[PDB]
Amino acid sequence: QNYHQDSEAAINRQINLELYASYVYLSMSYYFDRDDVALKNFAKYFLHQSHEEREHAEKLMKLQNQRGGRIFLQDIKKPDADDWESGLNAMEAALHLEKNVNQSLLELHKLATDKNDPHLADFIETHYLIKELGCHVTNLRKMGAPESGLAEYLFDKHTLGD
Amino acid sequence: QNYHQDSEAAINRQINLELYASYVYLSMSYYFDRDDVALKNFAKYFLHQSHEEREHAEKLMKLQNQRGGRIFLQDIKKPDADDWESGLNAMEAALHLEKNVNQSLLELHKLATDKNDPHLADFIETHYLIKELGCHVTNLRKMGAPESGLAEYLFDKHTLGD
Amino acid sequence: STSQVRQNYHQDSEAAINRQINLELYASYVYLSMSYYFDRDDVALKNFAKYFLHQSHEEREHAEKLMKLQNQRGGRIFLQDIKKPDADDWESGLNAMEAALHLEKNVNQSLLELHKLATDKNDPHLADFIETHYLIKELGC
Amino acid sequence: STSQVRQNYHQDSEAAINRQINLELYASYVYLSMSYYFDRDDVALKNFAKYFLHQSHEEREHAEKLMKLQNQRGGRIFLQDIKKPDADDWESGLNAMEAALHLEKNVNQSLLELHKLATDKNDPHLADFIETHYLIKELGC
Amino acid sequence: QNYHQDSEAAINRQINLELYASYVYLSMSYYFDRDDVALKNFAKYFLHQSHEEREHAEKLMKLQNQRGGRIFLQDIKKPDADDWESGLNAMEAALHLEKNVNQSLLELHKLATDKNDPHLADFIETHYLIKELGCHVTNLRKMGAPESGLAEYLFDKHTLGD
Amino acid sequence: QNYHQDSEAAINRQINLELYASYVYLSMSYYFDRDDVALKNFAKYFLHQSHEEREHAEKLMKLQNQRGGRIFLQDIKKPDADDWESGLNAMEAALHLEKNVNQSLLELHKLATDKNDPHLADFIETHYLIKELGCHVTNLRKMGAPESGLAEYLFDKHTLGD
Numbered sequence: 046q047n048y049h050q051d052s053e054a055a056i057n058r059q060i061n062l063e064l065y066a067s068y069v070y071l072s073m074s075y076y077f078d079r080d081d082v083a084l085k086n087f088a089k090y091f092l093h094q095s096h097e098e099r100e101h102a103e104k105l106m107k108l109q110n111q112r113g114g115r116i117f118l119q120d121i122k123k124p125d126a127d128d129w130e131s132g133l134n135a136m137e138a139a140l141h142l143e144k145n146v147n148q149s150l151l152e153l154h155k156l157a158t159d160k161n162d163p164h165l166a167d168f169i170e171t172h173y174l175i176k177e178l179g180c181h182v183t184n185l186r187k188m189g190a191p192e193s194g195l196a197e198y199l200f201d202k203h204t205l206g207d
Numbered sequence: 208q209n210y211h212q213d214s215e216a217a218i219n220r221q222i223n224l225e226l227y228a229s230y231v232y233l234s235m236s237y238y239f240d241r242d243d244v245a246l247k248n249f250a251k252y253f254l255h256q257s258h259e260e261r262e263h264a265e266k267l268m269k270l271q272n273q274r275g276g277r278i279f280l281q282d283i284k285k286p287d288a289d290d291w292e293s294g295l296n297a298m299e300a301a302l303h304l305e306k307n308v309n310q311s312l313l314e315l316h317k318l319a320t321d322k323n324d325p326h327l328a329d330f331i332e333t334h335y336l337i338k339e340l341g342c343h344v345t346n347l348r349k350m351g352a353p354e355s356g357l358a359e360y361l362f363d364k365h366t367l368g369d
Numbered sequence: 370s371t372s373q374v375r376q377n378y379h380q381d382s383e384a385a386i387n388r389q390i391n392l393e394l395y396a397s398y399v400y401l402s403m404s405y406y407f408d409r410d411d412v413a414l415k416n417f418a419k420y421f422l423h424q425s426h427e428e429r430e431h432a433e434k435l436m437k438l439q440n441q442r443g444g445r446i447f448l449q450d451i452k453k454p455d456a457d458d459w460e461s462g463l464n465a466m467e468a469a470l471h472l473e474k475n476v477n478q479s480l481l482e483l484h485k486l487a488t489d490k491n492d493p494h495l496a497d498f499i500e501t502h503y504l505i506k507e508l509g510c
Numbered sequence: 511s512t513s514q515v516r517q518n519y520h521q522d523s524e525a526a527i528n529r530q531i532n533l534e535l536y537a538s539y540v541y542l543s544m545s546y547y548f549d550r551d552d553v554a555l556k557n558f559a560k561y562f563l564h565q566s567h568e569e570r571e572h573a574e575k576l577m578k579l580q581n582q583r584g585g586r587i588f589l590q591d592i593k594k595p596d597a598d599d600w601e602s603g604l605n606a607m608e609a610a611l612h613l614e615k616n617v618n619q620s621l622l623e624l625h626k627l628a629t630d631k632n633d634p635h636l637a638d639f640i641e642t643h644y645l646i647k648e649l650g651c
Numbered sequence: 652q653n654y655h656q657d658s659e660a661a662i663n664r665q666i667n668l669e670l671y672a673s674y675v676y677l678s679m680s681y682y683f684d685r686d687d688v689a690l691k692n693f694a695k696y697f698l699h700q701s702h703e704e705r706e707h708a709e710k711l712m713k714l715q716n717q718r719g720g721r722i723f724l725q726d727i728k729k730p731d732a733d734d735w736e737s738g739l740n741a742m743e744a745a746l747h748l749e750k751n752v753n754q755s756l757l758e759l760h761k762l763a764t765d766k767n768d769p770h771l772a773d774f775i776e777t778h779y780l781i782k783e784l785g786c787h788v789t790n791l792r793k794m795g796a797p798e799s800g801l802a803e804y805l806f807d808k809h810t811l812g813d
Numbered sequence: 814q815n816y817h818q819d820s821e822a823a824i825n826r827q828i829n830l831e832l833y834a835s836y837v838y839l840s841m842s843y844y845f846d847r848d849d850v851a852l853k854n855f856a857k858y859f860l861h862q863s864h865e866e867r868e869h870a871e872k873l874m875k876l877q878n879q880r881g882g883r884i885f886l887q888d889i890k891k892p893d894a895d896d897w898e899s900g901l902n903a904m905e906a907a908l909h910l911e912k913n914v915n916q917s918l919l920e921l922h923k924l925a926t927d928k929n930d931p932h933l934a935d936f937i938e939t940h941y942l943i944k945e946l947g948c949h950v951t952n953l954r955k956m957g958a959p960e961s962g963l964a965e966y967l968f969d970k971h972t973l974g975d
């Protein structure tokens with residue numbers, strides 16, 4: 046039976062995807078920490094996200110062990126950008142990223158379903174950050190970002206500062 | 208005497224008008240809940256209004272029973288819009304709506320007066336939301352709405368967020 | 370066009386949530402009618418007035434959760450007329466319970482067809498939402 | 511021949527109570543099957559095991575009250591086979607809730623046809639018994 | 652409308668029927684108080700019944716007043732027997748009597764129903780003593796009554812003495 | 814190995830036998846609840862028995878699950894009688910029934926023994942009701958049952974009423 050082989054390879058792919066995502070948020074957080082960007086709450090938002098995604102990876106690592114599989118780590122690739130350009134662009138990038146992480150998470154779930162396997166730690170993690178990142182994107186665009194730096198300043202103070 | 212017949216038909220029309228209004232505010236509230244609109248306090252404002260107007264309907268239903276009339280329900284028609292376009296337009300629409308609900312409420316009152324009938328639950332509900340909706344409309348227009356999305360963002364944070 | 374947050378949300382699922390919203394609003398209307406019938410002095414059954422007013426507010430609260438879900442998933446809410454509740458009398462407290470039976474009967478059945486649809490389309494998010502929403506409607510406290 | 515206590519108890523009412531007794535026994539059987547399914551180590555849903563065992567004992571207790579009524583009115587109990595519950599698996603906890611839905615659906619509908627029958631035959635004793643028995647099944651605590 | 656006239660005549664017939672029944676149980680009770688019958692618990696059973704049936708009459712008298720009708724009393728006829736012959740025969744007679752009282756009680760109920768009138772004090776009093784009197788009859792016959800005086804002695808001690 | 818297949822079929826047969834027995838006692842209990850039989854303690858005796866036999870079935874259902882077998886239910890057949898004729902005959906029928914249930918229970922035990930399998934929930938349930946039902950049968954016959962209805966009346970009061 047190919048299943049426990051597929052099942053642990055999928056979990057292993059997902060572990061690397063979550064560590065990758067944690068790495069992207071870390072990169073974004075400290076971009077807003079730069080003196081020429083200097084948006085403190087944009088930096089806190091992404092840093093907190095960075096820690097949540099590392100927690101997702103550890104949860105899947107605990108899960109791989111509980112199912113008797115073998116954790117197989119890979120390189121954590123660098124993000125696609127060093128310069129994230131703007132708070133709008135970073136939120137757009139976080140939205141794209143979460144969608145892709147979620148898509149590979151549906152496939153993990155469609156593997157344990159579609160092979161009759163309850164015990165799907167997935168049922169807690171799915172789809173909640175996506176709408177929030179989309180709302181952030183929407184509000185920044187309506188305010189005039191990224192051309193308007195006043196928009197991102199005030200979004201940092203009013204939405205992400207609460 | 209035609210009166211108790213007119214009196215309960217009027218109360219019955221008003222019940223449906225209040226349920227209709229509650230339905231409009233519900234529609235507006237969840238329009239601002241959309242990810243491509245994403246104004247949380249606009250959505251809370253209209254939702255709270257939606258519940259107040261349902262309370263008005265129930266008060267008139269209790270009143271119809273206390274006067275020995277018969278409650279006669281009708282279809283609650285859908286609002287005129289699915290897309291309310293902007294926070295300004297929705298406030299303008301709420302203002303138009305409250306004026307029309309109030310006008311049919313004066314006629315209910317000019318029926319119990321003008322036919323010598325105290326016991327007018329109306330004397331508590333009349334004219335208070337209208338000036339507030341007008342002030343909201345005025346402030347949004349002065350700020351630059353609806354072309355300026357910065358205006359509605361800040362109005363949401365500063366006026367409706369208090 | 371398409372919502373920027375939409376992902377794995379079938380157009381049939383979106384349309385079925387929109388149908389379920391109107392059903393729950395309708396259920397709220399029907400329970401409200403019953404509640405103010407038992408409030409009549411003809412009838413004066415306060416226990417049944419009290420209980421159908423509570424069910425009216427619960428059904429309307431369930432509709433709003435379905436509306437919240439539609440937006441969270443990037444679907445678009447399309448509201449329709451809430452049809453009048455069909456009978457203004459309800460006669461006895463047991464003839465009302467019978468009407469409430471066929472109504473809760475069709476609302477819960479609609480939720481189970483929603484669950485089958487979410488399953489056929491491999492939408493675990495939708496399925497899990499419908500499941501708990503259904504167990505909630507059915508197993509209070 | 512005829513019971514010395516029988517009075518105003520139509521032969522159709524007697525036969526319908528005998529049908530309802532078997533239905534409630536059957537409902538008790540079906541709930542018991544479900545309960546020990548969720549007790550399997552495959553499944554291990556103790557909340558659903560606990561709840562369907564309680565419904566099994568309630569349905570069997572309701573059958574005995576119908577049997578008590580049949581004797582109080584001078585009818586004669588005639589028992590039939592309790593048919594096996596149809597499916598031994600039940601798959602998921604929600605596919606069981608769906609089966610429980612159609613079952614409670616048909617049991618309650620049978621009680622309402624019993625009430626209509628008691629009304630057509632001017633049996634206020636029977637009608638009032640079915641009414642409270644029905645509100646009890648439906649409004650616990 | 653003939654109804655309030657029929658409704659109070661029915662209540663008036665029922666009042667006299669309950670007083671009649673109370674009179675029959677009184678007669679039976681003190682028959683078992685005779686030295687040549689001498690069954691103390693048969694006498695307590697019927698006496699208690701005698702008081703319950705007087706309470707039924709008073710309940711219907713209170714009801715007639717609450718409905719704005721007029722109480723119209725009649726002669727309370729003597730029972731059909733002075734000598735009730737045996738404990739079996741008296742129980743058989745009580746069974747026949749309760750059935751007849753119940754039958755005129757269904758007609759009272761089929762008058763307020765069948766003329767759409769809730770407020771039927773009847774819904775508390777109907778059919779409960781009948782099965783008990785039938786069980787008593789059954790047990791006495793199976794024991795050997797009325798030829799066997801041992802049967803009625805022991806029934807008095809064991810069933811009616813508890 | 815045929816064993817776990819035989820072992821769960823036997824448990825499955827026994828489950829249906831206990832539910833069957835519970836059904837027989839239920840039928841007997843409410844026969845003595847009839848107004849023309851009217852023996853209250855005969856009805857309590859069999860009803861209590863009816864509940865004990867349902868508990869036996871559930872114990873074997875719990876056991877089937879603990880052993881990793883599959884519960885396979887069948888029709889619960891109706892008892893052989895609607896009219897149980899007399900308290901003597903019902904006790905005789907209960908005695909015959911318990912003997913047959915016990916015989917299929919020895920075979921269940923001679924299957925786990927005779928195939929070296931401790932873990933025999935049987936060791937708690939075997940042979941205790943049989944002697945009691947036989948004593949009841951003996952006493953009723955000596956008293957004059959079933960021709961004598963005095964006998965069953967007094968047995969109900971003195972033996973089953975304690």
Ligand SMILES: [Fe+3]
Pocket residue numbers: 063066097098101146
């Ligand atoms: Fe993640």
Ligand SMILES: [Fe+3]
Pocket residue numbers: 225228259260263308
């Ligand atoms: Fe209003």
Ligand SMILES: [Fe+3]
Pocket residue numbers: 669672703704707752
């Ligand atoms: Fe009476």
Ligand SMILES: [Fe+3]
Pocket residue numbers: 831834865866869914
């Ligand atoms: Fe047993």
